[PDB]
Each structure stands twice: as structure tokens, then as C-alpha cells.
mmCIF file of C-alpha atoms in Angstrom:
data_model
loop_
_atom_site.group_PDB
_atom_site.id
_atom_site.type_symbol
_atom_site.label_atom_id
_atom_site.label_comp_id
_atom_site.label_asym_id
_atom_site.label_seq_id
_atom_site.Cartn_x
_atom_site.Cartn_y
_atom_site.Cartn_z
ATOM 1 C CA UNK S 1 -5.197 1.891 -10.732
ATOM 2 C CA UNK S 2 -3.283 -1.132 -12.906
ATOM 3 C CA UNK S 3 -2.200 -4.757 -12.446
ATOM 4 C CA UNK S 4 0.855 -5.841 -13.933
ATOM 5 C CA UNK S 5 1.345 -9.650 -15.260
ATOM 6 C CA UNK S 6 3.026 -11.374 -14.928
ATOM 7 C CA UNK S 7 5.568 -10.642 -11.557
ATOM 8 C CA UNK S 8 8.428 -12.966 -12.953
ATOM 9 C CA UNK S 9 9.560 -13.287 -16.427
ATOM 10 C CA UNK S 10 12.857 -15.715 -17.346
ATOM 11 C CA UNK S 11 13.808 -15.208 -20.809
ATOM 12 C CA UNK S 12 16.439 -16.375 -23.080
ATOM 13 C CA UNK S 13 19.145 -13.422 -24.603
ATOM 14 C CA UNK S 14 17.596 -13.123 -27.727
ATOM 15 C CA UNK S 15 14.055 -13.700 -27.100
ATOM 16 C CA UNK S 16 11.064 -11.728 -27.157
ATOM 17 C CA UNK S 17 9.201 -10.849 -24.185
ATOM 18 C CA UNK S 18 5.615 -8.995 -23.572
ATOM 19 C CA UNK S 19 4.631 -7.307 -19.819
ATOM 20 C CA UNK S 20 1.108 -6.512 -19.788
ATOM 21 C CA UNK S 21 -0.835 -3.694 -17.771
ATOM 22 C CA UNK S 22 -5.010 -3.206 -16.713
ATOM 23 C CA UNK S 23 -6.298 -0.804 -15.326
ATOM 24 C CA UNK S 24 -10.104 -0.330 -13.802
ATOM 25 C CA UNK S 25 -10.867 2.626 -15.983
ATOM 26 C CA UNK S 26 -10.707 3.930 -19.719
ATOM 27 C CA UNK S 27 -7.503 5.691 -19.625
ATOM 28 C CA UNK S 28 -7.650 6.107 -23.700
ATOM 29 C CA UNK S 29 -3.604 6.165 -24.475
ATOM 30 C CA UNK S 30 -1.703 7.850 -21.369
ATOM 31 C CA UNK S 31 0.412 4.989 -20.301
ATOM 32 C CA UNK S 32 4.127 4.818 -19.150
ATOM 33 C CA UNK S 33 7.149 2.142 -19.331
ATOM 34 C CA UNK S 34 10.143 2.516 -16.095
ATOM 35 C CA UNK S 35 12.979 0.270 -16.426
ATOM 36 C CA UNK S 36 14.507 0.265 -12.564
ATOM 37 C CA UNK S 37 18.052 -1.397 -13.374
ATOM 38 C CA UNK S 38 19.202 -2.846 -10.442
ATOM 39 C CA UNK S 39 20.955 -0.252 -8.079
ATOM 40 C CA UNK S 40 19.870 2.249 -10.104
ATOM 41 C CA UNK S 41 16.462 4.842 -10.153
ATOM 42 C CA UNK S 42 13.898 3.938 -12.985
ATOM 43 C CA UNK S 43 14.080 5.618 -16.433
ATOM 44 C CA UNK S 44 11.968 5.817 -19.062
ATOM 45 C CA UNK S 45 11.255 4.026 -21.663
ATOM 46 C CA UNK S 46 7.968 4.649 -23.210
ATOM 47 C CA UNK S 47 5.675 7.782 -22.963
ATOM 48 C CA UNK S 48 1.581 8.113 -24.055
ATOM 49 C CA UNK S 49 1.235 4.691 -25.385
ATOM 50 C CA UNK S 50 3.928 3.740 -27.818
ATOM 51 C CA UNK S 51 6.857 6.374 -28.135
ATOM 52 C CA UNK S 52 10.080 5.659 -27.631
ATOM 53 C CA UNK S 53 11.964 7.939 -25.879
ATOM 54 C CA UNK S 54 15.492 9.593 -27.083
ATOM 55 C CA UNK S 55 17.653 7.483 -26.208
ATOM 56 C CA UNK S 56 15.776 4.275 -26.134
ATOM 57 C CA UNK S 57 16.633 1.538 -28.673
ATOM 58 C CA UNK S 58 13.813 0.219 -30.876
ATOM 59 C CA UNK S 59 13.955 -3.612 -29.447
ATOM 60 C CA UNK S 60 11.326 -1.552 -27.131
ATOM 61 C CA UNK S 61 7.824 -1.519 -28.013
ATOM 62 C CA UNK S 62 4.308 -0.389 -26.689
ATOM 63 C CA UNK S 63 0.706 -0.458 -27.602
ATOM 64 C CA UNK S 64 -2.847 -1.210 -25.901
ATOM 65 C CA UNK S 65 -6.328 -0.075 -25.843
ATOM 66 C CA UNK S 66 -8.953 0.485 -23.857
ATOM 67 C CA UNK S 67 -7.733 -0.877 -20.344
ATOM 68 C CA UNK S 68 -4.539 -3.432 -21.495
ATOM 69 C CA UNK S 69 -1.312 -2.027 -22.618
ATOM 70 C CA UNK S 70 1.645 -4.101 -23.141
ATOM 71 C CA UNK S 71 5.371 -3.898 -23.914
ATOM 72 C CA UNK S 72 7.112 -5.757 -26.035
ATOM 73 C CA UNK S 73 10.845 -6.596 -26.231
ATOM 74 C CA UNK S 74 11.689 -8.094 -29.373
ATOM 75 C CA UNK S 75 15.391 -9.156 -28.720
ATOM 76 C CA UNK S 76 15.989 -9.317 -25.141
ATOM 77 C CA UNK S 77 19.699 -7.940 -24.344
ATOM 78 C CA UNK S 78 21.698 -8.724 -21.406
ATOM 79 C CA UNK S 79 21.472 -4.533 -20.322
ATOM 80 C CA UNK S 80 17.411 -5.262 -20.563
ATOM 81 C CA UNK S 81 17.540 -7.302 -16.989
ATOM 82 C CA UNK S 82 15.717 -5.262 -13.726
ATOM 83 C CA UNK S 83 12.036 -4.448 -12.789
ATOM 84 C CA UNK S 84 9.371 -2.334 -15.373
ATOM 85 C CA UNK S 85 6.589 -0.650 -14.425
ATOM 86 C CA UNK S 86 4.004 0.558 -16.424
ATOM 87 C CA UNK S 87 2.505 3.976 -14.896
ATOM 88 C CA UNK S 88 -1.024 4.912 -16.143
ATOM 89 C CA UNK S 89 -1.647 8.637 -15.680
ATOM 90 C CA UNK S 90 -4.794 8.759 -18.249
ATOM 91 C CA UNK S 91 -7.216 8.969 -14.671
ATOM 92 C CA UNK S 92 -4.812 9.617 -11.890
ATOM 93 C CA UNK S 93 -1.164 8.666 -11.955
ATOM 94 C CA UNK S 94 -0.585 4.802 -10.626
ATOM 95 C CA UNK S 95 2.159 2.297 -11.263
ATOM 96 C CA UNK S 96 2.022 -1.456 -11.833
ATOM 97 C CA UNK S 97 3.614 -3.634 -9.245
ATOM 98 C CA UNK S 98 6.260 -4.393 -11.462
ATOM 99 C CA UNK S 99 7.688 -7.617 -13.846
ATOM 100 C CA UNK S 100 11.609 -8.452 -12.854
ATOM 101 C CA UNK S 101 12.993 -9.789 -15.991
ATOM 102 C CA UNK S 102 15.708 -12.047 -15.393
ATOM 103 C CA UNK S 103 18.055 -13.559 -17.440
ATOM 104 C CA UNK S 104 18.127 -17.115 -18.414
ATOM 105 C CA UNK S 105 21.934 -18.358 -18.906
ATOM 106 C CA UNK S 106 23.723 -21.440 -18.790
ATOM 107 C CA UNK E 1 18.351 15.270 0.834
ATOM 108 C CA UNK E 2 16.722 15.622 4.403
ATOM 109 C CA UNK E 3 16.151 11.662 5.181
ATOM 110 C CA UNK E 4 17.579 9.709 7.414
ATOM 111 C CA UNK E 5 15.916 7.568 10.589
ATOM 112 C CA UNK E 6 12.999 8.367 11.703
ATOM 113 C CA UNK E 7 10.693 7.687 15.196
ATOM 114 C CA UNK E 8 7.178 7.147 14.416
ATOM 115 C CA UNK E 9 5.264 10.130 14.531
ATOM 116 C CA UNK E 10 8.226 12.230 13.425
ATOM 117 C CA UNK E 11 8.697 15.267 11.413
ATOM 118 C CA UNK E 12 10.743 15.470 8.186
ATOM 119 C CA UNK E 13 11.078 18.299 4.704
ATOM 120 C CA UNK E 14 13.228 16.197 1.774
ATOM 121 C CA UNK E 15 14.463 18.630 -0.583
ATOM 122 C CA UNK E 16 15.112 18.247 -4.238
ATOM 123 C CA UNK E 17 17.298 20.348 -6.244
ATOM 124 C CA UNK E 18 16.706 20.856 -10.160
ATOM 125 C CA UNK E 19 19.227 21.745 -12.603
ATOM 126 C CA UNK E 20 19.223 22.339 -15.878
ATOM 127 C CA UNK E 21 15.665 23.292 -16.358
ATOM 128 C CA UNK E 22 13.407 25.762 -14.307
ATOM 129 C CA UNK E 23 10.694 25.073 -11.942
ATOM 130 C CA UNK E 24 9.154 28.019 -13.388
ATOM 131 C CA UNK E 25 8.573 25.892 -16.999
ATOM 132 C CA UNK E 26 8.359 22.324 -15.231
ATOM 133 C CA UNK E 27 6.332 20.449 -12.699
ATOM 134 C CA UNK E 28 8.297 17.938 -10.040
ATOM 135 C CA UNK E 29 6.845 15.628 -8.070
ATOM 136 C CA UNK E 30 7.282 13.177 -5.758
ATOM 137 C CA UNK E 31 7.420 9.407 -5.795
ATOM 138 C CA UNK E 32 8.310 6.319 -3.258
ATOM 139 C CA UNK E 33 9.700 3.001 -3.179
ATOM 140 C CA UNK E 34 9.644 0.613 -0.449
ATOM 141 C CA UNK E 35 12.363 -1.882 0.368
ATOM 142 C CA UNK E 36 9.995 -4.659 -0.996
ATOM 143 C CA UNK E 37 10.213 -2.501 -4.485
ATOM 144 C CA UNK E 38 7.002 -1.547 -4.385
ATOM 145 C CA UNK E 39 6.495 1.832 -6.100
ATOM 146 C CA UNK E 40 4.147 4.781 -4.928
ATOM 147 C CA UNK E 41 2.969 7.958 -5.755
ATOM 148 C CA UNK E 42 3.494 10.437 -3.057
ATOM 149 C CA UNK E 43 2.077 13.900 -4.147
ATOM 150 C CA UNK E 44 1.836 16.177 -7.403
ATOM 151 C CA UNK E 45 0.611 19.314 -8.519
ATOM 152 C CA UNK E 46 -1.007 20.409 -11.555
ATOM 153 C CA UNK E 47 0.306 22.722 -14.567
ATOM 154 C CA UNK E 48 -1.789 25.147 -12.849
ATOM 155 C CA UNK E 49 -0.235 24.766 -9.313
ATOM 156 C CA UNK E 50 -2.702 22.595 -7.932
ATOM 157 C CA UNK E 51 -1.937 19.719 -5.680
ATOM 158 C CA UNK E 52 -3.297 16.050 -4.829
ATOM 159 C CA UNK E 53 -1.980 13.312 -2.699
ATOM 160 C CA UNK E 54 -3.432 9.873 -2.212
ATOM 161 C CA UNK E 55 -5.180 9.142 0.867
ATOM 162 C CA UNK E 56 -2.246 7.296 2.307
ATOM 163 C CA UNK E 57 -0.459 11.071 3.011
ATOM 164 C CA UNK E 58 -3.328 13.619 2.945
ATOM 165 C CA UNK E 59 -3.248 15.807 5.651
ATOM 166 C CA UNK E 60 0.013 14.373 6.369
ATOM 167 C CA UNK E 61 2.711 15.451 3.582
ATOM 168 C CA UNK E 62 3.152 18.671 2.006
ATOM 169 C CA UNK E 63 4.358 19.341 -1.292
ATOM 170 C CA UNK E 64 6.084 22.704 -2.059
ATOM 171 C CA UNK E 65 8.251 24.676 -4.018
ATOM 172 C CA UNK E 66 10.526 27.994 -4.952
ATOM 173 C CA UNK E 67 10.189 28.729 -8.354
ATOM 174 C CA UNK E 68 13.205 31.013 -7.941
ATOM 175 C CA UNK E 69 15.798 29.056 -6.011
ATOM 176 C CA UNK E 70 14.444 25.948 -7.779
ATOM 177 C CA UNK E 71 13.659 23.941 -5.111
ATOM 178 C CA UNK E 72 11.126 20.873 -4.874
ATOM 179 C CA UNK E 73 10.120 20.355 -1.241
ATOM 180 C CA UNK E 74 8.202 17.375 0.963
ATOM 181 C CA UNK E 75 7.286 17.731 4.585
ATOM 182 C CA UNK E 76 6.129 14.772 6.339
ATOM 183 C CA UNK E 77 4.561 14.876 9.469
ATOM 184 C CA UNK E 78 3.252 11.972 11.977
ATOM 185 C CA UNK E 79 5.278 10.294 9.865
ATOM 186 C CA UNK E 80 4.207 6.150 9.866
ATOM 187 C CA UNK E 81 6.402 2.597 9.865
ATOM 188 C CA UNK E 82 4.932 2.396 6.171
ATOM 189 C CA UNK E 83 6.772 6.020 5.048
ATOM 190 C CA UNK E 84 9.790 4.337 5.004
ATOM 191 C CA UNK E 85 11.348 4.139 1.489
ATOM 192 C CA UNK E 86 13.543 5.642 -0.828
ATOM 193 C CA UNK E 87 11.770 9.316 -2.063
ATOM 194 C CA UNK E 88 12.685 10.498 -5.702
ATOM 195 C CA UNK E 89 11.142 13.449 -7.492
ATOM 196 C CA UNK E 90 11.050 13.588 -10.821
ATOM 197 C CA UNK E 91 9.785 16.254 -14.122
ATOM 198 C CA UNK E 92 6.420 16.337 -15.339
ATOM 199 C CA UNK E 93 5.186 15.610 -19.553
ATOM 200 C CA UNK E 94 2.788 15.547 -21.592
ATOM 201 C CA UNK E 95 3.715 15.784 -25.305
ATOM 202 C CA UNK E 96 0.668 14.275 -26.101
ATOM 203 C CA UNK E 97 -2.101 17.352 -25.944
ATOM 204 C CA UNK E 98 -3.144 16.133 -22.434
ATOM 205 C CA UNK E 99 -2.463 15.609 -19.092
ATOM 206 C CA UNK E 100 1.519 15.836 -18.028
ATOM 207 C CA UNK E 101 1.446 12.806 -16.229
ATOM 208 C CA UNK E 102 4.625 10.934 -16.365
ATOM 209 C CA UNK E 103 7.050 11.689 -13.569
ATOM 210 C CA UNK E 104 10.563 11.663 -15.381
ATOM 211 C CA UNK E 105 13.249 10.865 -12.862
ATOM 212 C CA UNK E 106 16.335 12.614 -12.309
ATOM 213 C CA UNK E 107 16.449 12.059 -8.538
ATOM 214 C CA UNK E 108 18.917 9.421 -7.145
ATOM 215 C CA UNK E 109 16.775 9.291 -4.038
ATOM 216 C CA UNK E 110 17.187 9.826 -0.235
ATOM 217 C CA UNK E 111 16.486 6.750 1.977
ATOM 218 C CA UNK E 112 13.827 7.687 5.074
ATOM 219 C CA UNK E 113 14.037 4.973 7.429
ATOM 220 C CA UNK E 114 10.881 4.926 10.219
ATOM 221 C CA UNK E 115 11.259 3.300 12.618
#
């Protein structure tokens, strides 16, 4: 299964943020980003670990080992705002209960 | 398509059509999300055809599909108050030289309200 921390996550344009993932068993590298934009379905972001998808810019990040995975945004945008989830399909296909990432403005 | 409102205990088949790809190369599968946002996994099968559920639908929901009209089915029987969600279905990969287990969207959903 996986725990996702932490649920809320204000951030600055410009600055970097980090959602983490667990899960209860060795799951090696299979491990999934979804960014749900608000009003929108979730898309994907990162695939086995660390790889970018084709479309994805690079501000996007993943790595992790053994149980904790985490991904890292390394200038937040203002289109980077909305819920991720990782999803961990190394054992048996589970998502995290989600980070909303929200904006901090004047 | 195929949701709608529901009264508990109710019957219900979503349907999900594919286009561009074929069913006959790619897996589909199907995933929830309650109004709280919470996300869950609803029922998937294999690369060999084989399917699972989680114990929150088995024996309940029944995952299904036409290779050749490419269509992804659900049906959801005794349906609950906690079925109610938005359903999406989304492609199976792998890439990786295991398991295809990422469900890549391309559903815009279809709201099942029990109730």
C-alpha cells in the first residue's frame, strides 16, 4: 500500500518542493507520479522510478529506494498547482492519498 | 458512459471506449475517485488476461472487454453508498522489463452517484 506526506504543501512560485511516498513492502523501482489539475483527470508525470514522461518538463524529478520515493519540483510554476499521487505498482497497484500543492501569492 | 444515480443495491455496466490504440495490444483498467478526492483502484487484468479486484468489489464488479469493438467494460452489482465516485479507465505500461502497472488515463470519467 503507500502513505503520502505531507497532505498540504504551500510553496512560493519559484521554489522547490519534495512529496514523499512509503509503502509496507519492497517494491524495488515501480513507482508512479499523477498530477490531478483541478477540474481535470490526473496525468502522468513520472513512470518506474524517475522517467519523465514525453511531454513533461524537467522541473519534475523522481527517485527512492527501498520503500520511500519522492518527487521533486525544482522551480515550482504557477501550471504545477492541484493534487499528486504517487501510485506504487511494484506489489499490487495502490495510490497515495495525495499532496495538494497550493500556491503561495501575495 | 453508463453512470448516473444509483439506489443502493443497484445494478450498473460503465463503458469505455478506446481510440487510437487497440485493446488487442493494450490493457485498460479501471480506477475511482470519491468526492473527498480520494483515489482507488477498482479492477485490472493482467497481460495475460487475468483479472484481480480488491476486496472492496470482489464478487461485486466485473471487468470485461471486446478486443474487436474495443470496448472496456465494468458491471457493478449490489452496488454500495461508498461506489459513488467518478470511474476512469485508463492504458496499461511497463517499459521497464516488468510488471505494466501504471494505469495511463485517457478517460474524462462518468460520475455514479449511490444513493
Amino acid at each position: 500500500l503507500m502513505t503520502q506526506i505531507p497532505s498540504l504543501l504551500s510553496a512560493s512560485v519559484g521554489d522547490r518542493v519534495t512529496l514523499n511516498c512509503k509503502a509496507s513492502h519492497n517494491i524495488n523501482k515501480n513507482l508512479e507520479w499523477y498530477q490531478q489539475k483541478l477540474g481535470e483527470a490526473p496525468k502522468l508525470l513520472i513512470y518506474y522510478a524517475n522517467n519523465l514522461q514525453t511531454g513533461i518538463s524537467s522541473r519534475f524529478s523522481g527517485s527512492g529506494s527501498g520503500t520511500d520515493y519522492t518527487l521533486t519540483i525544482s522551480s515550482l510554476q504557477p501550471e504545477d498547482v492541484a493534487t499528486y499521487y504517487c501510485y506504487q505498482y511494484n506489489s499490487g497497484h495502490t495510490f497515495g492519498a495525495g499532496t495538494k500543492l497550493e500556491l503561495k501569492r501575495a | 458512459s453508463g453512470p448516473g444515480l444509483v439506489q443502493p443495491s443497484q445494478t450498473l455496466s460503465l463503458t469505455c471506449t478506446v481510440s487510437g490504440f487497440s485493446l488487442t495490444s493494450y490493457g485498460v483498467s479501471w480506477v475511482r475517485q470519491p468526492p473527498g478526492k480520494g483515489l482507488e483502484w477498482i479492477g485490472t487484468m493482467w497481460n495475460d488476461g487475468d483479472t484481480d479486484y480488491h476486496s472492496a468489489l470482489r464478487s461485486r464488479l466485473s471487468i470485461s472487454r471486446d478486443s474487436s469493438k474495443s470496448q472496456v467494460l465494468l458491471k457493478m452489482n449490489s452496488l454500495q453508498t461508498e461506489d459513488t465516485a467518478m470511474y476512469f479507465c485508463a492504458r496499461s505500461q511497463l517499459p521497464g522489463y516488468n510488471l505494466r502497472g501504471w494505469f495511463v488515463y485517457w478517460g474524462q470519467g462518468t460520475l455514479v452517484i449511490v444513493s
